[PDB]
Amino acid sequence: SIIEEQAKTFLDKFNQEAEDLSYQSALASWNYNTNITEENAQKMNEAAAKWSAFYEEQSKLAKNYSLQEVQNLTIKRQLQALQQSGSSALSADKNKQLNTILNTMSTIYSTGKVCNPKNPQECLLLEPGLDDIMATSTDYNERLWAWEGWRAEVGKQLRPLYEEYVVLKNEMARANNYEDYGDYWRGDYEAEGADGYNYNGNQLIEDVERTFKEIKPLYEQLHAYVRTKLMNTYPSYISPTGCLPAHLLGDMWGRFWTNLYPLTVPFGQKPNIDVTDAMVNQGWNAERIFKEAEKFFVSVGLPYMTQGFWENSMLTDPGDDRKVVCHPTAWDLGKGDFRIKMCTKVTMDNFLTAHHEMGHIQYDMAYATQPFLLRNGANEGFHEAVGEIMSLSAATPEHLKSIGLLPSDFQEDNETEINFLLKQALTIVGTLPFTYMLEKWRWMVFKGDIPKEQWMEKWWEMKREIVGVVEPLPHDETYCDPAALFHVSNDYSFIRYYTRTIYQFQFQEALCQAAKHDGPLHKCDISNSTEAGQKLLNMLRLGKSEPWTLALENVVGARNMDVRPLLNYFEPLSVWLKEQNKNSFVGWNTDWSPYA
Amino acid sequence: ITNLCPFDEVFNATRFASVYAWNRKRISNCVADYSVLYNFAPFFAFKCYGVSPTKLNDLCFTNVYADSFVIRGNEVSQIAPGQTGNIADYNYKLPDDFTGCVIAWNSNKLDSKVGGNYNYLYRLFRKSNLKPFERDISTEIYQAGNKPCNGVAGFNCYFPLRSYGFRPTYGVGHQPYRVVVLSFELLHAPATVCGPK
Ligand SMILES: *[C@@H]1O[C@H](CO)[C@@H](O)[C@H](O)[C@H]1NC(C)=O
Ligand SMILES: *[C@@H]1O[C@H](CO)[C@@H](O)[C@H](O)[C@H]1NC(C)=O
Ligand SMILES: *[C@@H]1O[C@H](CO)[C@@H](O)[C@H](O)[C@H]1NC(C)=O
Ligand SMILES: *[C@@H]1O[C@H](CO)[C@@H](O)[C@H](O)[C@H]1NC(C)=O
Ligand SMILES: *[C@@H]1O[C@H](CO)[C@@H](O)[C@H](O)[C@H]1NC(C)=O
Ligand SMILES: *[C@@H]1O[C@H](CO)[C@@H](O)[C@H](O)[C@H]1NC(C)=O
Ligand SMILES: [Zn+2]
């Protein structure tokens, strides 16, 4: 056609002109982050500003090519990403109003203080003030007042802001031919292609529900075990056949159950596997840690690291008159520039984090030849799923025995395996119903099924049914409990943490059948296996050029998401839990309350 | 041995030309010493066609043409007979029946500055391809739509030349490269370029 050729020329010019601006912004950001100084900030901002302006023009100038007149799919995929305009679909006054609401919510969340009764002279902040109390203490009332103060001091100031936040965002969504803001988030999973490779945003709801109905029984068993273990430390505050109080889950919101390991350890006389002492004794530094990961990656048939990686990356804390941001990150600055920022210490957790980040770097290098606007992960869950499987494979007591950190005559008992699986369960399985419930509530609130006058009732009626958590004190319609979470009050999607967990295990299974592995799935090492690496690189090199269904099929063999590998991973623990819960009740009821 | 050819002011020049304005030098009436040529950099590319790579200094030709320019790293493969792309379609074309050598090496330490080197240009749009060994240095505005452009840039009206902007922290495939193409011709005339005796 005629429009297609013009679109091709326009995309050629855009690709030529966008790389330079994006690279300049990335370099400015890197220089600011690794070297904190006032005038290093201003330049950063300036760079970012220009980029925005450039984009904000092209997204308009690209709306003049009708999308239905373009027939070849790659051009359509590149043009659709450019045509999508977000907050620019509104007028100036409403955009300013939305921005001033968002800034106010973020500021309220950041600087919030809960003042302890009993001589209220020393008030505590959020990050190093209440996380310690809710992760280390074992006092009922001490946890109760910290839990209630955060909702009565920060949750009650975010209700009127949230109410109009919702109204503004629904109008912004309908300005882009949608139904609500929930549809705007669910449209990230849209896929268009051949017959059988298509995907809408309405099938995500059904897939999530279908997966949760299968995941539920294992969560019930773990729930029963944790309930019967928490009665030894809180005797009179827990019912044997009821729910669990909210402020007794080792976290401020109950998102993660890791901090319950000291109280729920199966066998306390057998310690976990730690190799820090061996690492310090033999003599190790950051460079050795980062080279023993490159060996792992080139074992399976993947490229070496670029020379510029070893010169332009900060792998240690400078330890001088220079201030740096100490948070691991992998940077893809563009134009063949790959870097890693990380303060490395000689510990096992850093040893695993190195693998996690080099997974991101290897993923980025695979699709560097793809055109711009098609140079990201297949969806918002593939990028961490690649990193996590490498960490899983590089921590088994057979890979450590090969690199020499364990004695050659080390035999593993069955008591340590149960402990390892329980620790993994407390952080993987215990966060899935929470995410499901939160996202379901937000979707219903956005679409209109939950009226404004019934918000907290639905909250603490869904939490007592889907999850199994009961509130300690009554909460009327003056509070806003969900707003007390970082992601809810900062415009962040939350379902990406649910899909990723489903994806990773699938990947692992497909990479353990190709490696010719015989045994339980939680003892799989994909090192010294070339077919596994080739099969993974079959998917790594696509990017967004193809629908994510084809990318999933290229590595797994199925066009959708399933939970069978996750249940296969946790099978010995399931058997042990069933054996250990004979004289106990599996389940809960929604009628018992601590306050009544 | 008293008339060595001037290959030293073709490889050791202090400033190379852009791809769309490639520089051509004609060499005739001298003795060619194709052995100092090996004394330079590791020569990322020393590939050549129709001529034995080790017995060049055995045959006589009537003219030797040297073409010099600077391209990117992932474009050297486009300097070859019978290839399609961007450099080989709008900038520099080699005939299918080619007899000569192609030499290409790295120049990151010389043609790359902090902030960007914007002195090197290449053509991005053209109405038709190039016949082999042809040059275009026009700067009229490319017209992509039915609307007549009328000497002004805008919608469906693009300036045909763009820049590289080399920086030292780029990858190998985006770093500067210097390319010299040697073309030997043998026409009906006395042969005047030969190797040392
Ligand atoms: C950090 O930034 C300052 C400018 O404020 C600069 O002078 C200094 O050289 C930078 N640090 C390094 C290691 O280059
Ligand atoms: C391009 O789009 C703008 C709106 O942003 C419009 O005013 C202009 O007429 C369009 N140009 C065309 C259709 O040639
Ligand atoms: C679509 O465009 C791409 C450009 O990346 C091209 O390679 C391809 O041949 C075109 N046609 C089809 C059917 O993909
Ligand atoms: C992988 O192959 C290397 C090379 O022989 C060998 O030393 C090593 O023990 C093998 N296994 C692992 C887990 O590295
Ligand atoms: C571990 O193996 C021993 C060896 O027979 C067995 O007696 C014990 O019951 C096993 N424990 C678990 C938790 O599997
Ligand atoms: C360029 O000059 C250097 C040193 O002057 C040396 O490599 C040689 O003389 C020249 N190289 C070539 C290929 O002529
Ligand atoms: Zn990560």
Side-chain angles (χ1 to χ4, degrees):
Chain A
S1 82
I2 296 170
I3 302 299
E4 185 159 306
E5 274 296 328
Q6 309 189 26
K8 188 182 286 185
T9 303
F10 174 67
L11 282 172
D12 291 331
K13 183 179 77 69
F14 182 82
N15 294 352
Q16 192 287 344
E17 194 157 357
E19 288 285 334
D20 177 40
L21 282 165
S22 160
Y23 184 84
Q24 278 158 116
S25 66
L27 199 56
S29 179
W30 172 269
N31 285 117
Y32 170 70
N33 269 35
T34 77
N35 187 0
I36 296 192
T37 300
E38 182 65 26
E39 79 282 347
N40 284 138
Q42 183 179 1
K43 295 184 289 294
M44 172 187 170
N45 293 317
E46 293 179 353
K50 291 177 70 68
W51 176 233
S52 67
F54 179 75
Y55 212 75
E56 265 307 323
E57 183 67 27
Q58 302 279 313
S59 281
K60 292 177 71 68
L61 183 63
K63 288 211 188 77
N64 272 344
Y65 307 118
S66 179
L67 195 62
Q68 299 67 244
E69 304 256 359
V70 161
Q71 309 288 342
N72 184 34
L73 270 187
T74 65
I75 299 298
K76 182 187 290 223
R77 263 194 269 276
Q78 298 175 57
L79 198 64
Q80 213 174 340
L82 206 56
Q83 283 192 358
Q84 292 297 109
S85 65
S87 66
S88 303
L90 283 159
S91 67
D93 54 355
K94 286 186 178 180
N95 212 341
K96 178 189 297 322
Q97 198 166 343
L98 193 53
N99 271 316
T100 199
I101 290 174
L102 295 175
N103 211 332
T104 313
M105 293 183 286
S106 177
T107 300
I108 287 187
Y109 179 82
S110 180
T111 61
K113 281 167 163 283
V114 176
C115 285
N116 167 40
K118 309 206 318 291
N119 192 8
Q121 211 274 319
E122 192 266 332
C123 303
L124 277 296
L125 203 76
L126 166 63
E127 296 300 319
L130 293 188
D131 303 346
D132 203 301
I133 297 169
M134 294 273 285
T136 310
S137 64
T138 319
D139 191 282
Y140 190 90
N141 301 131
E142 176 184 25
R143 297 171 79 90
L144 187 70
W145 62 261
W147 190 84
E148 180 84 355
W150 185 250
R151 269 96 174 148
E153 300 262 36
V154 190
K156 291 180 136 151
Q157 322 195 9
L158 291 171
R159 181 71 181 268
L161 283 78
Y162 212 83
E163 291 184 3
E164 65 183 1
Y165 165 60
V166 167
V167 163
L168 285 174
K169 301 300 276 286
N170 281 318
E171 154 170 358
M172 183 278 288
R174 292 189 296 272
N176 302 326
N177 295 356
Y178 274 119
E179 279 171 325
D180 63 358
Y181 193 56
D183 213 344
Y184 186 99
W185 285 351
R186 290 193 297 266
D188 178 38
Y189 287 87
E190 193 78 56
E192 174 190 17
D195 186 74
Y197 288 129
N198 294 352
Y199 209 72
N200 318 90
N202 286 323
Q203 316 187 16
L204 189 78
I205 310 176
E206 309 177 321
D207 290 351
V208 167
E209 293 179 353
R210 172 182 64 89
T211 51
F212 191 70
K213 293 182 183 293
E214 313 191 41
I215 285 186
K216 192 172 178 67
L218 184 64
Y219 179 60
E220 291 201 342
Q221 292 278 335
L222 190 64
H223 193 246
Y225 184 68
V226 169
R227 187 172 50 185
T228 181
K229 294 297 287 186
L230 284 175
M231 275 162 72
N232 304 2
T233 174
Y234 312 120
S236 65
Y237 308 106
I238 290 193
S239 66
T241 76
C243 300
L244 282 173
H247 65 279
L248 308 172
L249 295 177
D251 202 353
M252 177 78 158
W253 315 273
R255 193 176 169 217
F256 289 132
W257 292 10
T258 314
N259 305 331
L260 291 190
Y261 187 76
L263 301 188
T264 71
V265 57
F267 309 98
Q269 295 297 109
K270 301 291 180 68
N272 263 305
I273 297 196
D274 212 315
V275 295
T276 306
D277 180 34
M279 272 199 253
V280 176
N281 275 20
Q282 305 196 327
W284 279 43
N285 63 7
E287 187 199 276
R288 177 85 156 281
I289 293 191
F290 272 96
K291 291 207 160 261
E292 290 275 357
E294 172 183 50
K295 285 177 70 175
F296 175 81
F297 273 95
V298 307
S299 176
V300 308
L302 288 192
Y304 276 86
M305 284 281 125
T306 297
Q307 184 48 85
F309 175 93
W310 297 108
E311 322 187 2
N312 301 116
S313 302
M314 180 210 57
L315 304 177
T316 57
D317 194 342
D320 67 333
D321 305 303
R322 185 178 67 187
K323 293 187 286 185
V324 299
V325 169
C326 197
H327 184 32
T329 300
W331 293 65
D332 186 74
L333 296 92
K335 308 229 179 164
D337 220 348
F338 314 102
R339 300 175 193 205
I340 290 177
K341 159 168 82 54
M342 188 180 138
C343 319
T344 310
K345 299 291 180 68
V346 176
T347 57
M348 184 157 141
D349 58 356
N350 278 182
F351 184 61
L352 298 191
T353 306
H355 290 76
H356 177 108
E357 294 294 328
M358 185 179 288
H360 293 312
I361 293 277
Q362 287 270 3
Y363 194 81
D364 274 314
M365 290 171 42
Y367 56 75
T369 74
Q370 291 289 323
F372 208 76
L373 289 88
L374 292 179
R375 198 175 290 170
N376 221 318
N379 63 26
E380 61 185 3
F382 279 94
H383 212 81
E384 288 289 327
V386 167
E388 298 275 353
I389 62 171
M390 295 298 102
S391 179
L392 288 177
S393 179
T396 63
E398 294 293 328
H399 172 90
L400 300 166
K401 186 183 287 185
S402 88
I403 60 175
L405 288 173
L406 282 189
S408 171
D409 54 355
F410 170 83
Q411 59 184 357
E412 192 168 36
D413 53 355
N414 49 338
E415 305 201 327
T416 317
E417 316 186 322
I418 302 299
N419 293 19
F420 177 63
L421 284 174
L422 186 64
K423 190 170 216 213
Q424 292 278 279
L426 278 179
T427 185
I428 289 170
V429 182
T431 189
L432 262 56
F434 183 87
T435 297
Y436 172 52
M437 183 278 288
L438 180 72
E439 198 66 26
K440 182 175 174 66
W441 178 89
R442 296 175 70 187
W443 287 342
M444 293 177 70
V445 167
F446 280 143
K447 182 174 72 68
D449 307 356
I450 288 176
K452 183 143 55 43
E453 285 91 331
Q454 293 179 356
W455 266 14
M456 295 298 102
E457 193 205 353
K458 294 298 186 291
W459 188 248
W460 302 103
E461 164 172 333
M462 293 177 70
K463 187 172 280 289
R464 299 154 70 112
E465 182 65 26
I466 288 158
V467 178
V469 172
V470 55
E471 64 271 6
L473 293 172
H475 276 173
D476 61 345
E477 282 286 340
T478 312
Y479 307 75
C480 194
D481 296 329
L485 185 61
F486 173 73
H487 295 72
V488 176
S489 80
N490 291 58
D491 295 345
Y492 281 150
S493 295
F494 210 71
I495 204 66
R496 57 161 83 201
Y497 303 93
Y498 182 87
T499 63
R500 154 185 85 76
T501 307
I502 296 317
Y503 286 154
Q504 60 174 4
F505 292 110
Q506 287 188 245
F507 291 2
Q508 177 91 321
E509 210 182 35
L511 295 183
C512 292
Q513 297 177 351
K516 303 278 154 263
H517 171 73
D518 62 357
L521 189 62
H522 70 267
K523 287 147 71 91
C524 184
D525 200 33
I526 69 165
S527 62
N528 289 338
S529 192
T530 303
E531 55 268 14
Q534 291 288 330
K535 182 174 72 68
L536 179 67
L537 205 66
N538 265 19
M539 183 278 288
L540 260 57
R541 64 169 38 111
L542 290 175
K544 282 175 46 210
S545 65
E546 306 265 28
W548 64 266
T549 48
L550 192 147
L552 201 57
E553 185 185 70
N554 275 18
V555 63
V556 171
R559 266 157 211 195
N560 216 337
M561 65 180 288
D562 74 27
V563 294
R564 274 196 321 90
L566 194 141
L567 273 71
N568 189 359
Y569 189 98
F570 284 117
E571 185 75 13
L573 188 63
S574 168
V575 171
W576 190 77
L577 279 183
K578 295 205 214 220
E579 200 295 327
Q580 192 93 354
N581 264 337
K582 296 183 290 294
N583 290 318
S584 296
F585 188 10
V586 167
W588 63 78
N589 57 354
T590 64
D591 286 17
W592 176 86
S593 66
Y595 66 83
Chain B
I1 310 166
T2 182
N3 204 6
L4 292 193
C5 297
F7 281 161
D8 61 297
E9 293 83 3
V10 177
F11 294 66
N12 265 328
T14 45
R15 179 179 178 274
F16 271 46
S18 306
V19 178
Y20 84 99
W22 40 272
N23 198 359
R24 165 159 266 187
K25 201 193 182 285
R26 186 273 304 278
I27 282 151
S28 66
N29 277 98
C30 58
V31 298
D33 59 356
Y34 300 112
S35 295
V36 180
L37 194 148
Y38 274 42
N39 290 26
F40 209 68
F43 276 4
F44 177 52
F46 182 75
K47 302 311 158 262
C48 63
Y49 316 83
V51 160
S52 294
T54 61
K55 326 169 208 57
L56 307 88
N57 169 356
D58 269 324
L59 183 63
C60 289
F61 293 100
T62 180
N63 270 326
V64 175
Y65 282 113
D67 309 79
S68 296
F69 48 91
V70 160
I71 62 177
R72 211 205 291 150
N74 56 31
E75 279 154 44
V76 181
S77 65
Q78 300 209 18
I79 284 291
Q83 293 262 19
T84 61
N86 203 333
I87 297 314
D89 269 317
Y90 304 140
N91 299 259
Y92 187 82
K93 187 71 180 294
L94 266 187
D96 291 331
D97 45 359
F98 184 53
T99 301
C101 295
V102 162
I103 305 167
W105 74 91
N106 197 344
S107 65
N108 185 31
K109 292 177 71 68
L110 294 174
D111 305 67
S112 179
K113 65 184 287 184
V114 163
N117 207 24
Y118 286 124
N119 302 329
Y120 294 113
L121 300 175
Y122 69 108
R123 178 174 307 253
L124 198 40
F125 308 118
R126 194 169 201 266
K127 291 176 71 175
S128 66
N129 288 358
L130 276 163
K131 272 77 69 177
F133 285 144
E134 195 195 342
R135 185 179 296 113
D136 207 340
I137 59 171
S138 66
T139 72
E140 284 87 5
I141 294 171
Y142 180 68
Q143 169 176 307
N146 52 26
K147 183 178 179 180
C149 199
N150 177 129
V152 57
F155 188 71
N156 294 17
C157 274
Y158 307 111
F159 198 65
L161 298 162
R162 283 309 191 285
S163 194
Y164 278 155
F166 291 122
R167 308 201 165 76
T169 62
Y170 281 0
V172 176
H174 284 258
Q175 265 163 7
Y177 273 78
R178 293 181 161 194
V179 178
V180 191
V181 176
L182 293 162
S183 166
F184 316 103
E185 73 179 5
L186 183 63
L187 273 71
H188 164 74
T192 192
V193 165
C194 301
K197 184 175 175 65

